[PDB]
Amino acid sequence: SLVSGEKTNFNHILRLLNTNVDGKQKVVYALTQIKGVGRRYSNLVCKKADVDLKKRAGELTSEELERLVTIIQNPLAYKI
Amino acid sequence: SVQAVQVFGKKKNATAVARCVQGKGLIKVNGKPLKLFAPEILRAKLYEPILILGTDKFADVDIRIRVAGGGHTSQVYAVRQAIAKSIVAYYAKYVDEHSKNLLKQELIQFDRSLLVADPRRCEPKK
Amino acid sequence: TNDLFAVTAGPRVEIFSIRKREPLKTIGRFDSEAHCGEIRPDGRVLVAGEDTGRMQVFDVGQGTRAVILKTWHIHKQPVWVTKWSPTELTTLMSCSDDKTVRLWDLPSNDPTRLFTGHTDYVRCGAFMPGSANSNLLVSGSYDETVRVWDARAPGGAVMTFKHADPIEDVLPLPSGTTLLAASGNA
Amino acid sequence: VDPDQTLKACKALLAHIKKTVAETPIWLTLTTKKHIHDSHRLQPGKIILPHPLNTSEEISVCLITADPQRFYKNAVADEFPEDLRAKIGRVIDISHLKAKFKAYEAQRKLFSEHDVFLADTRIINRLPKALGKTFYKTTTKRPIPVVLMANANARPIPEIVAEIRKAIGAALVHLSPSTNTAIKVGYANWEPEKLAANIETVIRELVERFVPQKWQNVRNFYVKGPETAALPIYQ
Amino acid sequence: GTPWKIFKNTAFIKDMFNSSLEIAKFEGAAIRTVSGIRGQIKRALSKPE
Amino acid sequence: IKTYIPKFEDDFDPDKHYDPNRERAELAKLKAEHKRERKGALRELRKDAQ
Amino acid sequence: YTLLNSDEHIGIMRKMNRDISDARPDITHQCLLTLLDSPINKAGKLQIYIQTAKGVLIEVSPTVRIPRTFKRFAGLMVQLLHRLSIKG
Amino acid sequence: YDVLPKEVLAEVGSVKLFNRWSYDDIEIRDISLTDYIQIRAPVYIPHSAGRYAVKRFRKANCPIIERLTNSLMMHGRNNGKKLMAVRIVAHAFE
RNA sequence: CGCGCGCUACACUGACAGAGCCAGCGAGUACUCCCUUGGCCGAGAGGCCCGGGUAAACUCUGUCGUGCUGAGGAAUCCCUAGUAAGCGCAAGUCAUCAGCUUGCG
């Protein structure tokens, strides 16, 4: 009667750099919800961070979230 | 010497040359085969005359069709008219007149536009 | 004869192929989770219950089709198992989490019959295969009860069986007489 | 012709330019003494440079073929994922090009999308009417020849990949029926010694391959910036 | 002036006037080519002033 | 329900344009007056030509 | 530009002899007030239409707070009647 | 077969709408409308180029599914897309 | 300032990317949208070179999901079969018409 539900707590409102509200929609549409980001821009962001587009928002780990924050912070030190 | 029957099909501005020769059974339209030439929803209107007359009637003929002019629906109607008129004229010319009459009977019992193109004249209520 | 079997895992189901053993199409329309994705005996329509209480039934072709046919949002609390009836192609059963199993007809937008009697989570269910047992449902709850209901009398359990363990799984036999209730260590 | 004179003129012209920030193409204008007539000499070509003209970091080429686009898309999906599948964005046959792109807005969108263009020698003679005048006549973003020539009658694929590697960084060579022309050589943000090597080999190949009556018909080469003065190298 | 676009008969003429005001003063006028073709200024154009 | 307040102007009349920025309002009014005067001049010159 | 009531235009209507007690916007004003403060409106089970005798249908949604004062109400009604809609 | 795919060859027996649905046992419920619902005359797809509006009661002889398509193509944006209409009816019947 | 007539814009009838497949009328040694920064060859007038400002449609296949990214009142007018409506291409014909007109599919 013990099965690890270590992933089920993801329908919670995530926090990010400018908006403190970002639900579970998708990675690229969540980054579209982030203010100042376009859809192709978020696609470029996800492809740069090598996060799979199949994966949802809230299925991520903290280090992946943080490197997403760093690469939305600077778009030039990463190639573009 | 070789048996051949050429027939014409008409629509608004879609015309259809259909030349029928004794063959293995194939049917081509602009070279490409019949199951390929159409938008993917009018293929039943193409198969309507073959499906009425059965495949054994087309077992011996080989139909090559050219088409040009008009839009998609117009070309499809031109090809089905050319198919029906081709097989009826071939059966008129090279097999028995009774078989021709039975074929023309089944086709007219379905729809007359398979044989005689009825153009849309302008005659509104005068 | 077909080449489809479905695996639900998380907020998405993944319809697999049998011949190729490659995930043929991943369906991720869900809101929260996906608990049981079962395709019809026909082999064209997948049903799945979400964690938000809704159940979605949608057509799936041999390739990439995810066309939502119907949705139901009556449970308002997680739906853990839905199953089709093996005989009737348009009737399905659903054990929710709260206290209920219920029989749905696919065209309708309301449950055909409602069945209560359990006291905790109910989380396994099955139809009774066989010729004589046309309309008999069996469900195992977490209240250590396996109940079998007739679908002609919408009252209580026609038969009940009380174990001492949380009852996790149930299958009937194809013979129709005997049944396996998987509960705890035995 | 001397690289010392060429290097001092290029250094002084880089100084004149200086006195993101620059981003100006420096080129050289060839001037000859007689009119040019042969359409096979009017046929545009390319010159391989020892320092490639491109940056090659995010530039995305658009390739134009003639024989089946399905086969060429098969080749690009098969062969090379390191640089070639990173840089090839679209391959389009000439039939699909004339089909999907006759519109002003459509070809302007394509011009805005892609970064540089390659086409086959069997298609360049049809290209200028096919692509728009806004695509072709105005700016240097115009297709560069590749030799995709011996079911497509095509040279084998590894040689094709080598050809694309050369022709991405090559420089275009277009000729005018008149007695004047100009060929790009580099940018102002570069090093003038590399500029000197580039202009040296450009001069050599231009005179020995394209300009008919090789050095009898040759005349003045002026190194020039976009809007500044021109510095002389006679020939 | 100078012809700008030339259809079968009608032709647009560019470097002759500065404004639709001047043209609407000279509306209905008897223009003439060098070749000998007579013609008539008919109506001001709009988009190039 | 989250009620909302109807945005409307107090002294209403259809003949006056309503805009906050005096700059863009003045620019539009000047463009319209210029257009009307130009049309009047074109009509008067056309009648003179006839 | 102002609604036609019996508050100021009484002398004009009494002069021209047309039904001084029919030009009564205060009835519609107080009825809209009553129905927008009634608790079924807050529940959202309400939807209110106005048929003005020139024949004009006016859909009023529950989410609006009508101005309490008759003067603001009159200015609002005029702007609505001349621009076919009112934005929030 | 002359040139016919597998599904039409399978259902070569009689005439079925969209090559899947039968006409054989289609009961109508009202003796009033058994005259004016035309399902005696079969059809393959509803798109049939006919002059079914020359005089009265020729829509009483055009088939019923042709009427369904021709009434589906009724707004200011879908006035000519009869292929969209028959695609929609095929999807809805599936 | 007023009135109509056309034109444009206003989202499910969506966007993006691929694949496939259709017209008719049109041929006067004739047709070009600018204006300019520079430079070549030009005693002078110019010509060169480089920069700046055979359809629409439709069908099929996938990626994504309603998000100032809201189809028009009272009235009044018109319309009954290749009619309404949608769609583009061509031409510019001694009067009218480029802010458009007439053809044609």
Tab-separated table of N, CA, C and O in Angstrom, chain C residues 64-115:
chain	number	residue	atom	x	y	z
C	64	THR	N	-2.796	9.155	-36.095
C	64	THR	CA	-2.909	10.309	-35.200
C	64	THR	C	-4.321	10.878	-35.275
C	64	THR	O	-4.621	11.805	-36.031
C	65	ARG	N	-5.203	10.318	-34.457
C	65	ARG	CA	-6.533	10.870	-34.254
C	65	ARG	C	-6.768	10.937	-32.757
C	65	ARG	O	-6.416	10.000	-32.033
C	66	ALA	N	-7.310	12.056	-32.287
C	66	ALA	CA	-7.633	12.233	-30.874
C	66	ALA	C	-8.963	12.961	-30.720
C	66	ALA	O	-9.110	13.864	-29.897
C	67	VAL	N	-9.961	12.564	-31.502
C	67	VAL	CA	-11.142	13.406	-31.680
C	67	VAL	C	-12.123	13.167	-30.542
C	67	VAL	O	-12.707	12.087	-30.436
C	68	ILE	N	-12.339	14.184	-29.712
C	68	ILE	CA	-13.140	14.029	-28.501
C	68	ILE	C	-14.603	13.848	-28.875
C	68	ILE	O	-15.225	14.749	-29.442
C	69	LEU	N	-15.151	12.671	-28.576
C	69	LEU	CA	-16.559	12.428	-28.842
C	69	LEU	C	-17.425	12.994	-27.732
C	69	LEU	O	-18.286	13.840	-27.978
C	70	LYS	N	-17.217	12.543	-26.500
C	70	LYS	CA	-18.032	13.038	-25.403
C	70	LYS	C	-17.184	13.242	-24.164
C	70	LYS	O	-16.064	12.738	-24.046
C	71	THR	N	-17.739	14.010	-23.238
C	71	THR	CA	-17.139	14.249	-21.940
C	71	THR	C	-18.242	14.196	-20.900
C	71	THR	O	-19.387	14.552	-21.183
C	72	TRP	N	-17.908	13.737	-19.704
C	72	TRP	CA	-18.831	13.783	-18.582
C	72	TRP	C	-18.120	14.362	-17.373
C	72	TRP	O	-16.957	14.033	-17.117
C	73	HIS	N	-18.817	15.218	-16.634
C	73	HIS	CA	-18.251	15.898	-15.478
C	73	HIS	C	-19.211	15.849	-14.309
C	73	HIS	O	-19.552	16.864	-13.706
C	74	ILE	N	-19.669	14.654	-13.975
C	74	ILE	CA	-20.704	14.489	-12.966
C	74	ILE	C	-20.056	14.063	-11.654
C	74	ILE	O	-20.566	14.361	-10.570
C	75	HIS	N	-18.883	13.436	-11.742
C	75	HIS	CA	-18.271	12.837	-10.560
C	75	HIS	C	-17.710	13.878	-9.601
C	75	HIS	O	-17.846	13.734	-8.380
C	76	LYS	N	-17.072	14.925	-10.131
C	76	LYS	CA	-16.504	16.050	-9.379
C	76	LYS	C	-15.468	15.616	-8.341
C	76	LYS	O	-15.177	16.367	-7.407
C	77	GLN	N	-14.888	14.434	-8.503
C	77	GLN	CA	-13.982	13.801	-7.555
C	77	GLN	C	-13.399	12.636	-8.345
C	77	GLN	O	-14.125	12.088	-9.176
C	78	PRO	N	-12.130	12.243	-8.137
C	78	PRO	CA	-11.417	11.397	-9.109
C	78	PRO	C	-12.127	10.133	-9.557
C	78	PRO	O	-12.830	9.478	-8.791
C	79	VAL	N	-11.937	9.802	-10.827
C	79	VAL	CA	-12.492	8.596	-11.415
C	79	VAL	C	-11.356	7.629	-11.660
C	79	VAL	O	-10.470	7.894	-12.478
C	80	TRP	N	-11.380	6.504	-10.966
C	80	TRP	CA	-10.217	5.645	-11.042
C	80	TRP	C	-10.355	4.560	-12.091
C	80	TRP	O	-9.346	4.186	-12.692
C	81	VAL	N	-11.551	4.035	-12.362
C	81	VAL	CA	-11.598	3.035	-13.423
C	81	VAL	C	-12.873	3.144	-14.241
C	81	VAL	O	-13.975	3.284	-13.706
C	82	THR	N	-12.705	3.113	-15.561
C	82	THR	CA	-13.817	2.953	-16.490
C	82	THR	C	-13.558	1.703	-17.314
C	82	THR	O	-12.407	1.383	-17.602
C	83	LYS	N	-14.611	0.969	-17.651
C	83	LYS	CA	-14.494	-0.241	-18.453
C	83	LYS	C	-15.664	-0.322	-19.420
C	83	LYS	O	-16.756	0.156	-19.118
C	84	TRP	N	-15.443	-0.919	-20.583
C	84	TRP	CA	-16.548	-1.089	-21.510
C	84	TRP	C	-17.309	-2.368	-21.203
C	84	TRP	O	-16.814	-3.265	-20.522
C	85	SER	N	-18.516	-2.457	-21.717
C	85	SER	CA	-19.148	-3.757	-21.615
C	85	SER	C	-18.713	-4.616	-22.792
C	85	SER	O	-18.710	-4.147	-23.929
C	86	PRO	N	-18.356	-5.874	-22.554
C	86	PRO	CA	-17.886	-6.713	-23.657
C	86	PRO	C	-18.981	-7.090	-24.626
C	86	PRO	O	-18.679	-7.390	-25.786
C	87	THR	N	-20.240	-7.065	-24.204
C	87	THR	CA	-21.340	-7.416	-25.085
C	87	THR	C	-21.905	-6.204	-25.808
C	87	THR	O	-21.909	-6.165	-27.040
C	88	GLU	N	-22.381	-5.211	-25.070
C	88	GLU	CA	-22.955	-4.027	-25.684
C	88	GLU	C	-21.871	-2.999	-25.959
C	88	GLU	O	-21.103	-2.623	-25.074
C	89	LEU	N	-21.827	-2.535	-27.201
C	89	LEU	CA	-20.759	-1.652	-27.637
C	89	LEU	C	-20.925	-0.223	-27.159
C	89	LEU	O	-19.996	0.574	-27.317
C	90	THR	N	-22.078	0.131	-26.601
C	90	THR	CA	-22.347	1.501	-26.202
C	90	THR	C	-22.592	1.664	-24.715
C	90	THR	O	-23.085	2.717	-24.303
C	91	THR	N	-22.321	0.651	-23.908
C	91	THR	CA	-22.551	0.735	-22.476
C	91	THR	C	-21.227	0.598	-21.749
C	91	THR	O	-20.421	-0.275	-22.081
C	92	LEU	N	-20.987	1.461	-20.773
C	92	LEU	CA	-19.752	1.349	-20.017
C	92	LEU	C	-20.036	1.502	-18.534
C	92	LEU	O	-21.062	2.044	-18.129
C	93	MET	N	-19.128	0.980	-17.724
C	93	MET	CA	-19.212	1.115	-16.283
C	93	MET	C	-18.080	2.003	-15.813
C	93	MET	O	-17.041	2.118	-16.467
C	94	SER	N	-18.286	2.637	-14.669
C	94	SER	CA	-17.251	3.475	-14.088
C	94	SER	C	-17.315	3.397	-12.581
C	94	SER	O	-18.352	3.707	-11.991
C	95	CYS	N	-16.214	2.996	-11.962
C	95	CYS	CA	-16.043	3.108	-10.525
C	95	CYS	C	-15.295	4.401	-10.283
C	95	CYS	O	-14.139	4.544	-10.719
C	96	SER	N	-15.944	5.330	-9.593
C	96	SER	CA	-15.316	6.572	-9.195
C	96	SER	C	-14.489	6.329	-7.953
C	96	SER	O	-14.198	5.198	-7.589
C	97	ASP	N	-14.109	7.408	-7.288
C	97	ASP	CA	-13.395	7.233	-6.039
C	97	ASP	C	-14.303	7.342	-4.832
C	97	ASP	O	-13.934	6.851	-3.766
C	98	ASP	N	-15.458	7.997	-4.955
C	98	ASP	CA	-16.128	8.421	-3.735
C	98	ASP	C	-16.845	7.282	-3.030
C	98	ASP	O	-16.341	6.763	-2.034
C	99	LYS	N	-17.964	6.856	-3.559
C	99	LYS	CA	-18.654	5.675	-3.070
C	99	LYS	C	-19.338	4.916	-4.188
C	99	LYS	O	-20.010	3.923	-3.903
C	100	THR	N	-19.201	5.340	-5.438
C	100	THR	CA	-20.137	4.989	-6.490
C	100	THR	C	-19.484	4.229	-7.625
C	100	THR	O	-18.347	4.515	-8.017
C	101	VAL	N	-20.220	3.268	-8.157
C	101	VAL	CA	-19.996	2.841	-9.525
C	101	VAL	C	-21.274	3.182	-10.263
C	101	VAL	O	-22.326	3.373	-9.646
C	102	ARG	N	-21.176	3.327	-11.574
C	102	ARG	CA	-22.368	3.692	-12.318
C	102	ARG	C	-22.244	3.238	-13.757
C	102	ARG	O	-21.153	3.226	-14.335
C	103	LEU	N	-23.380	2.859	-14.317
C	103	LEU	CA	-23.463	2.425	-15.697
C	103	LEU	C	-23.940	3.588	-16.542
C	103	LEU	O	-24.988	4.186	-16.255
C	104	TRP	N	-23.171	3.885	-17.581
C	104	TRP	CA	-23.424	4.937	-18.541
C	104	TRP	C	-23.834	4.323	-19.869
C	104	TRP	O	-23.308	3.280	-20.278
C	105	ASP	N	-24.757	4.989	-20.547
C	105	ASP	CA	-25.020	4.746	-21.954
C	105	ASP	C	-24.359	5.864	-22.737
C	105	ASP	O	-24.459	7.030	-22.356
C	106	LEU	N	-23.673	5.506	-23.818
C	106	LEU	CA	-22.872	6.489	-24.537
C	106	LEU	C	-23.654	7.644	-25.161
C	106	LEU	O	-23.149	8.778	-25.092
C	107	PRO	N	-24.833	7.470	-25.779
C	107	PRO	CA	-25.510	8.655	-26.326
C	107	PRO	C	-26.024	9.597	-25.262
C	107	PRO	O	-26.006	10.815	-25.467
C	108	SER	N	-26.462	9.071	-24.129
C	108	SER	CA	-27.044	9.890	-23.085
C	108	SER	C	-25.989	10.763	-22.425
C	108	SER	O	-24.786	10.561	-22.595
C	109	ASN	N	-26.460	11.760	-21.684
C	109	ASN	CA	-25.599	12.612	-20.884
C	109	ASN	C	-25.883	12.467	-19.402
C	109	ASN	O	-25.727	13.427	-18.644
C	110	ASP	N	-26.311	11.290	-18.982
C	110	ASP	CA	-26.634	10.995	-17.601
C	110	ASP	C	-26.436	9.509	-17.364
C	110	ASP	O	-26.604	8.708	-18.287
C	111	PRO	N	-26.056	9.114	-16.150
C	111	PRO	CA	-25.822	7.693	-15.873
C	111	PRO	C	-27.095	6.882	-16.003
C	111	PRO	O	-28.157	7.294	-15.536
C	112	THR	N	-26.981	5.729	-16.662
C	112	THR	CA	-28.122	4.832	-16.771
C	112	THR	C	-28.511	4.276	-15.417
C	112	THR	O	-29.689	4.326	-15.049
C	113	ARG	N	-27.553	3.756	-14.657
C	113	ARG	CA	-27.866	3.300	-13.309
C	113	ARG	C	-26.757	3.710	-12.360
C	113	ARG	O	-25.602	3.857	-12.759
C	114	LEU	N	-27.121	3.883	-11.096
C	114	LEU	CA	-26.186	4.281	-10.058
C	114	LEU	C	-26.138	3.183	-9.010
C	114	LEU	O	-27.181	2.651	-8.627
C	115	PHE	N	-24.941	2.845	-8.541
C	115	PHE	CA	-24.776	1.792	-7.553
C	115	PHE	C	-23.892	2.287	-6.425
C	115	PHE	O	-22.746	2.698	-6.658
